[PDB]
Amino acid sequence: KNIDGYFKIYSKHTPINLVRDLPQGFSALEPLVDLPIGINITRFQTLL
Amino acid sequence: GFNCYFPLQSYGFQPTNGVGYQPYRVVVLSFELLHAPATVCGPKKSTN
Predict the structure, then answer these.
(1) Which residue(s) pair with A31 in the sheet?
(2) Do B35 and A36 touch (CB under 8 A)?
(3) Sequence-distant (≥ 6) Cβ neighbours of residue A1 within 8 angstroms
(4) Which residues are glycosylated according to the annotation (chain A)?
(5) Does A36 touch chain B (CB under 8 A)?
(6) SS3 for chain B, per residue?
(7) Could you tell me if residue B24 is left (phi over 0), alpha (psi between -120 and 50 degrees) or otherwise beta?
(8) 3-state secondary structure A1-48
């Protein structure tokens, strides 16, 4: 997300044994990266 | 030529040229302020 010109990254690596879909349950995600990028973001892409 | 000159001229910088012609290294610090999160700040004075 980008709020107040601040880019935030959250993560969680809980083990998942259901390969079909995300199992029912709750898991909060801790913050990892708090870099103030300052570049407006309107598009997204993924690397493989 | 007579009316054509090289845009760049070289310093003398002789060892005995004297103050006012001796080389001086200048570092100019410019403070950029914008509507972006602040990244550079003065030290936080830590006390016991």
Answers:
(1) A10
(2) no
(3) A7, A8
(4) 40
(5) yes
(6) CCCCCCCCCCCCCCCCCCCCCCCCCCCCCCCCCCCCCCCCCCCCCCCC
(7) beta
(8) CEECCEECEEECCCCCCCCCCCCCCCCCCEEEECCCCCCCCCCCCCCC
